[PDB]
Structure formats: C-alpha cells, structure tokens
Enzyme design. Structure first.
Site, PDB file in Angstrom:
ATOM      1  N   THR A   1      31.407  33.601  37.053  1.00  0.00           N
ATOM      2  CA  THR A   1      31.835  32.946  38.259  1.00  0.00           C
ATOM      3  C   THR A   1      31.960  31.414  38.070  1.00  0.00           C
ATOM      4  OG1 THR A   1      29.602  32.568  39.144  1.00  0.00           O
ATOM      5  CG2 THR A   1      30.542  34.617  39.692  1.00  0.00           C
ATOM      6  N   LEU A   2      31.476  30.904  36.939  1.00  0.00           N
ATOM      7  CA  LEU A   2      31.456  29.463  36.657  1.00  0.00           C
ATOM      8  C   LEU A   2      31.880  29.202  35.228  1.00  0.00           C
ATOM      9  CD1 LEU A   2      27.884  28.788  38.099  1.00  0.00           C
ATOM     10  CD2 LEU A   2      30.112  27.867  38.954  1.00  0.00           C
TER      11      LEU A   2
ATOM     12  N   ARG B   1      24.837  35.254  40.129  1.00  0.00           N
ATOM     13  CA  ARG B   1      23.710  35.374  40.969  1.00  0.00           C
ATOM     14  C   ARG B   1      24.022  35.112  42.414  1.00  0.00           C
ATOM     15  NH1 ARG B   1      20.147  31.297  40.216  1.00  0.00           N
ATOM     16  NH2 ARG B   1      18.562  32.482  41.370  1.00  0.00           N
TER      17      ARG B   1
ATOM     18  N   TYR C   1      15.855  28.671  23.295  1.00  0.00           N
ATOM     19  CA  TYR C   1      17.294  28.895  23.283  1.00  0.00           C
ATOM     20  C   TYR C   1      17.780  29.298  21.880  1.00  0.00           C
ATOM     21  CZ  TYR C   1      22.155  28.050  24.753  1.00  0.00           C
ATOM     22  OH  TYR C   1      23.466  28.229  25.157  1.00  0.00           O
TER      23      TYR C   1
ATOM     24  N   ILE D   1      30.796  22.237  25.524  1.00  0.00           N
ATOM     25  CA  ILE D   1      31.958  22.486  26.371  1.00  0.00           C
ATOM     26  C   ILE D   1      31.711  21.772  27.704  1.00  0.00           C
ATOM     27  CG2 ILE D   1      33.298  24.270  27.553  1.00  0.00           C
ATOM     28  CD1 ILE D   1      33.508  24.405  24.509  1.00  0.00           C
ATOM     29  N   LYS D   2      32.747  21.052  28.135  1.00  0.00           N
ATOM     30  CA  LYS D   2      32.720  20.294  29.385  1.00  0.00           C
ATOM     31  C   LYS D   2      32.842  21.299  30.526  1.00  0.00           C
ATOM     32  CE  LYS D   2      35.215  16.489  31.875  1.00  0.00           C
ATOM     33  NZ  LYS D   2      34.015  15.674  32.029  1.00  0.00           N
TER      34      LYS D   2
ATOM     35  N   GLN E   1      29.213  19.996   9.298  1.00  0.00           N
ATOM     36  CA  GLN E   1      28.503  18.877   8.636  1.00  0.00           C
ATOM     37  C   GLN E   1      27.039  19.088   8.686  1.00  0.00           C
ATOM     38  OE1 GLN E   1      29.618  15.306  10.793  1.00  0.00           O
ATOM     39  NE2 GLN E   1      28.443  15.833  12.628  1.00  0.00           N
TER      40      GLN E   1
HETATM   41 MG   LIG Z   1      24.656  20.269  10.225  1.00  0.00          MG
END
Ligand SMILES: [Mg+2]
Ligand SMILES: [Mg+2]
Lengths: 251, 251, 251, 251
Positions: free
Chosen positions: B15-16, B38, B155, B190-191, B251
């Site tokens: 939804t977002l 939710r 995470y 990601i924006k 990198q």
């Molecule tokens: Mg690296």
C-alpha cells in the site's frame, strides 16, 4: 514493447546463439543493433533474418582485435548514430583443467574472453559517457565467474576477471557521473546449435546435481535479462551480477 | 506491455512505497493484484488509486500473522482465481546495533521480516505448485542481506536469513518440478515518503562512500526488476539474488 | 611451533613486505623456503636475514617468466627436495581506471598477476601431486578480488581471475585425488615500507569508510593465515577464500 | 603451542563433536575453557576428559535460554576471570524443506541457532569490550549459510542470518574501537559419532557431487581454524567468513 526506444546497441558474437537472441529481442524492443561475428557468410544472413539494415547490421570482427574495435564503433555510429549500449558477449572455451592447459590455449582464450571484454568496456566508456544516452555496458560472464569447474580452468579465470573488472568500471562511471552503467550477466547452461553438436552435453548439464531444474535454458532466457539491463528500467543497477542458471549456483 | 498476462499476484506491504510501485506496474502489465497493509484507510485508498476492483484489491494483514495468511490466499483466489505470484515485501527496521538491540525489538523485527517471509513462502509453494501457472515467489531482501550495517543488527539477521532460505525453497521447488521459482531482490536505498520523513536520511545515503551514484533510487527501480521476475521471461531464474543498489555493494 | 614440519615452500616475491613475513614465519615453523624476487642484492640479503641456507634460499625470478618457473622448481628441489607448498604472492599494481588503462599497462599487470599465478599453479599441481606431501598452493589475491575499486581496473581483473581459477584447480585436484589443495588469501590494506614512502597513504586507507578498524594491517597478519593454509591443519580446506581486511569488505 | 596464552573462552555445545574438539585444542593452546551442553553427565565427563578444573569446566545450558547466558558469563568469570573469547557452536537441525516445516520446528530451530547466537553475541560484546583482551567472537555457521539445501529450509534461514548478523556486529565493534572481532566459520560435512550412527550417511556426504575431496572432514579441521580466529594471530580479521568444506561450495 518499445522498452529500448532510441537505443543503439553493439552485440559482440551476435550472429549465433545467445548473442543472436539478444539482437532479436533488442530489435523487437526498438533498438538499432550492430551484431559482430567472425564469418561474413553467417553474419550477413543473421542480420537479414532479424530485420532490415535500418534496424540491424553486421560487422565482421574478432573481439580480441583492438584496432577493429575502433572501426566497429565508427561503423555503428555511421549507421545508427551514437552508441548507447554494448553487450560484450563474444567468448570461447577450452575444455581443459588448469593443470592440462597449454600456454597457447591460455593466451588464445584470454585474448577473446578477457582482453576483448576490456577493449570493449574501455572504448565503450570513452564513447558513451556524458551524452545523456542512458548508456549501459552488459558484460557476459558465466556461472563460471562464481564457481569453479575442474575442466574449465582458463575459462574460470576469464569469467572471474570480467566479473570484478566490471565492478571497477561500474564504480568509476558512477563516481564520475558518466551516465554509463556496467553490469554482468551470468548464464547457466543454455541450449544452442553448438551444444546440440556435442553428444551428451545437454544431458550432462541437465542432471539435477548440475542444474536443479533438470533441463537447460534457451537463448531468450538471456536475451530478456539483457533487455532489462539495456533499458532505462535498470537505471539504478550498476556493478551487479545477474544470474540466470536454473539453480546451478544455488546449491 | 502485457508482460504479466493472466498472472494473479499477492504483494505484502503493497500500500506504500516500493510495494505500491510493484503493484502499480504489475497492474499495468496485466496482473490481478491483492495488496496488503496494516491500515484499511491507507489500503483501500491505495488500491483505488491504482485501478478498479477487478484489477486490484486490498486485504488487511500483518505479515507476521500466520492464520491471516490462509485468509489472504483464500480471499485473493475468490477475487481473482488461483494465485500465481507472491511478493514478500512487508518489512520493518530497528535502528540498533546488535549490542544495543533489546530482545523485544529482536522478536518484533524477526516476526515480520523472517517469520512472515517464511509463512508466505511455505503457503505460496503449497498453493501455487503443480498448476502450470508459471509461479514465482519474489522475496524482498536488501543490500543488508549481503553486507553488514553496524546499526541494523536484527535487520541484517533477517535479510541474511531470507537470502539463504529462499535458495533452499528454490532448489526444492526445482528438484520436485513444482513450477514455482523463488528469487530475492536486494534494493539499495530508495526514496519514499518514509525516507523523506527522516531529516538527512537521503543525504547520508547519497554520499559516495555509501551509494556511488551519488543519489538514491526510486520505487519503480524495484518494481521493474519485480516485473521481470514475476513474468515468464525469467522462467530459468531460480535461487538467485537480484541487486539494484546504485553501486552500494560493488565497493 | 613446528606447524610446517617437513614442508618445502616456494614463495614468489618473498624478499619484501607480505612475502617476506610469510617466509619468516614459514621458517619459524620448520619449513624450508625458496624466496623469489627481482633484485639479487635484496634477495640474498633477505634470505640471510631470515636464516641459513639449509632453511632458506633466494632465486631471482620474474613471475611472468614461464621458463624461469621450471628453473625455480628445479632449483628448489635441488636445495631442499620435493616442493610441497607454493605461495603465489608476487604482484604489481597500476593506478588507473579501466577507462584510463593503456593496453601496455593491461598486459604488463596481467603477465605478472595472472599469467604468473597460472604458470605457478599449473606447474605446482604437476610437480606436487600424488607424492603424499600434503601439498598446498596459496594464491594471493586481495580484497580487490571481491570488490571493485574505480582506480584499480586491471588489478581487479587480475584478482577476480585468480579467485575463480583457483577454485577450478582446487576442484580438479580434489576430484583426481592428487593430494593438492588450492586456496586464496585476500588481504585488505597492509602497512609496508612502500606505504610509508607515500605521505598520507596510510591515513587515507585508515579512514573508517575504507577500513572499519580505523588502521591498516601488518605483514604478519597475512603470514599467519598462510601458515594455517600451508600446514596440514587445513587439510579439509580447498577452493576457499580467506579474507583478512580489517572489515573492509564487510560493509 | 601457547597460541591462546591468557585467553578465557566459552564454547557452547562444547561437550561433543566439533565443540569438543574446539575445546580440546583451545586447552592445548593455553586457554581456559567453559564448555556448555544439555546433559550434565556428559558435560562433566567431557571437561574431565580434556583437563583439570583450572583449565576447563562445564556449565549446563540451552543456548536458547536468555537468562542462562548471563549465568554462564558470570560463572565463567568466577572460575577464570574476564571472558575474552566466545564460540557460538551449539545448534540443531530439522530435516525438512521450507514447504514441509511446521511452525513449531521453525521456532524451535530458530531459538537455538539464531536467538541463541544473538544472545551470546550481544552479551559477549557487552562483557568483552574495552578490556584490552583481544576479544574474539566466532559464530559457527555452516556451508548452509552460503548455499541452499532443499531439505534444510529452517537451518538455511538460521545460517544465513548468523552470517550477516555477524558482519553487523563486526562493523560496530570495529567502528567503536571495542577490541572485539566477530567472524564466522562454515564447516562442510564432518564425521562425528552421530554421523556414524546413520548407516550410509557418510558415504552419501562423500559423493563427489557433494564433497569433491570424496570424503568428509573431522572435528579437528574446525578446531584448528577456531584456534586461529581466537588467537591474536587474526587481529586484523573481522567480519569475514571462513569455509572449511572439502570443496563443497567451490562447485
Ligand atoms: Mg562494500
Ligand atoms: Mg555449488
């Protein structure tokens, strides 16, 4: 449909197999394409089979030929305008372990699979950067750029090199705002006429201990991930490896 | 155009943000979609913004809710027919080092980011296999499934787990000829509106030492690689990781 | 103490830095060592700085010299008996992007960093197999075999190649029951006199965005991992990459 | 000899197999060791089989027990002084695909293999930081943290999680100058009495399609890499994965 609007692509080894499928789908999505290959008889037939000269042309070239690279770019520019997209696809193999590889075999393979990729990448960056083309350089590895095969020594060397060299080029191009992305594609085994020519090859590659899917892929499996990478859909992907392998490297 | 002809997709956290872009592009390529979230207020507005109920609906669900998963599949089947495609996208974060993570934080995060992905993957395989749907399960990781971040301990755990669990499921599905592929997608930064809400976050993520491109991506960068993976274009890809990260991990 | 009892090692580029520390620790652990290097004055002094001729000798060699490799193995045998252990440590760098690398710089770096490692690995397998030596070939990469650096294009190509070629050679040796293991070592930044000669180099390499530890390593950090790999302690390790980098590649 | 002078180690699941070999070699190298296990009868006998109470003791503990971790660190301190080294070795397996894993099996495996490693890593950082101990946390994965196995779904999730969480903890400890390193060890198949109790298991694990060496390893193959990681020899290694697998993951 029209996912490659306005693009101009060079595909090395574009006259057969994976290269040819890439070319075919590139033309279908609106790109102008120059395919290369070693034999004009095959090359010109391949180009005509896909479309007309204003869509696709052939250019005879051995990717290990540094000076020919310059000609290839110039020819493609003359035909289609500034090149935006480069698929370094031409490659050869030697069926030898590291222990059993002759030095001549080693140099021959490297000149195509490594030097050729280097020449294309280096020239592509110089010609494509800073033109607002959405430029993309797609370097063909292999699953052999991730895992060893005991009877592909020099091939493994070449594909490991392309893998990491491509990250270097990706990063420089990003850090310098060149508007050039560089990524690698890593096919598993793919059914082509050449594979069909080696008795028992597909059957060996299709064993579950090799490819979990229990069969090998087809040239269009590679062409579709290449369309994505050439397209501006993939404008935030650079320096990444894209594997399409039936599960080979997952186990 | 029509790259997802006949597909039926569930997108968790649809939804977002990234989820919503996935949904939008899925509908645009011909898929029927059930998005989850939710909050019904947000969810129903999101669904209507993308299309009509015969294209896209909302279903309220917390991905950590095992029993709700069954309801979600049943509802999606009732609306659209047999599910072919599952995007496990719902996730949360905790901004803590491993040392500074409370056990409550740990369990809360795992229940969404790991248990939820497990419940979806397990149920998806059972419901989607052996139906000739061209089924595809796309599990959202992260760049944090490849590299550590000192302040994303739990995470990182969750995303490393999803990465390798997904390979296991890929291989079983391949070896059993289930006609289900499982792959992971690994966004860089990601924006989104949520990022826009954290002062200085995009600016930090856009430093060259983080993202070489010198800016972050947008939700459609993730939606396009998801279209590819849901589509039968990617029929030979399974067990693979697809990174779209601006060079972060290069990198 | 006596961790390398009975071993006979060749270490290329053994007269300075990392190579010299490897040689020093090898001798301390009971190996017989032949070090190579370009300058006889340096090499002879280095061998004598470590021990007596019954423990360590020097052989002048450029690792790009195919025939000289045969001479090095012959010489080492004549001094010490059959070689059991090879460390392919010699290497050079070019500080250029792929875009800015001349063809001459490309070929010169590959001749040392890639062909030389091939020549040593190939000849080592031939010579060390099937002799009950517990033979071990340790191919020095680098962190640049994992990640790119925008200003080390050719170096990245060479370190990627060594990484995967070494897996090929591991697999063949295992499959053929040769009693030869092949593994790679991947140093991050290491303090040597050459670093000390470049003002600011260590400080830059010590920034947290480069090395999370906030300082760089020392030659003995690479010597200790090499003693492990050369010793029979690591008899079940082959085809693996061993990283000693201060965190560089973990972020 | 004396490679772990002065160290104080906790080894979870130290009473059998890999853990017991780690403990044995640790004591041989001068560490003080607290081993944990579920059965007091076994644990006490194992500690006494290795050395005297001034060298090694047992503490009964289930690694999923949060509070008991505090008790284990307290107990070890009381016996030996401040802990410098933690080996998170305890683990369990479930022989199921993701598709066939019950939720109860999922939670039970995660509680040991994931939460337990979190609890030990978190508390170890808290207790070992900033004490000049040369502290080292060695988190046991597995090859199943790199590759999937179709019949180890939950186990793969747990080993992926430990792999990347351990990088997060490495980075934070480095960045904060805590004098704590965190690294992972990834055994392939290892011969233990439990393997010996399953007819045919070793032979299957020894097939070349599984282990290229054509045999499986022994507990001391994992103990020696752990001595390296616990010792100050590996002071520049953090956030890395160390694989000891007979070639399994190289193909
Ligand atoms: Mg690296
Ligand atoms: Mg494999």
């Amino acid at each position: 449909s029209n996912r490659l609007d306005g693009k101009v692509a060079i595909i090395t080894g574009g006259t057969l197999g994976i290269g040819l499928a890439i070319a075919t789908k590139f033309v279908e999505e609106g790109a102008k394409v120059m395919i290369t290959g070693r034999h004009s008889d095959v090359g010109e037939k391949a180009a005509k089979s896909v479309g007309t000269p204003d869509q696709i042309q052939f250019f005879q070239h051995d990717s290990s030929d540094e000076d020919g690279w310059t000609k290839l770019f110039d020819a493609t520019e003359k035909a289609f305008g500034p090149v935006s997209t480069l698929v370094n696809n031409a490659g050869i193999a030697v069926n030898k372990s590291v222990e059993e590889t002759t030095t001549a075999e080693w140099r021959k393979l490297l000149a195509v699979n490594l030097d050729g990729v280097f020449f294309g990448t280096r020239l592509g960056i110089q010609r494509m950067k800073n033109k607002g083309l959405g430029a993309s350089i797609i370097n063909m590895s292999s699953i052999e750029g991730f895992v060893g095969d005991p009877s592909l020594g020099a091939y493994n060397a070449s594909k490991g090199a392309v893998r990491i060299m491509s990250k270097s080029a990706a990063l420089d191009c990003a850090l310098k705002d060149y508007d050039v992305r560089v990524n690698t594609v890593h096919p598993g085994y793919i059914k082509t006429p050449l594979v069909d020519d080696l008795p028992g090859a597909e059957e060996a590659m299709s064993q579950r201990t090799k490819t979990p899917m229990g069969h090998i892929g087809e040239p269009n499996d590679i062409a579709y991930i290449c369309v994505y990478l050439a397209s501006n859909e993939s404008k935030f992907a650079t320096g990444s490896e894209f594997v399409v392998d039936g599960g080979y490297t997952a186990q």
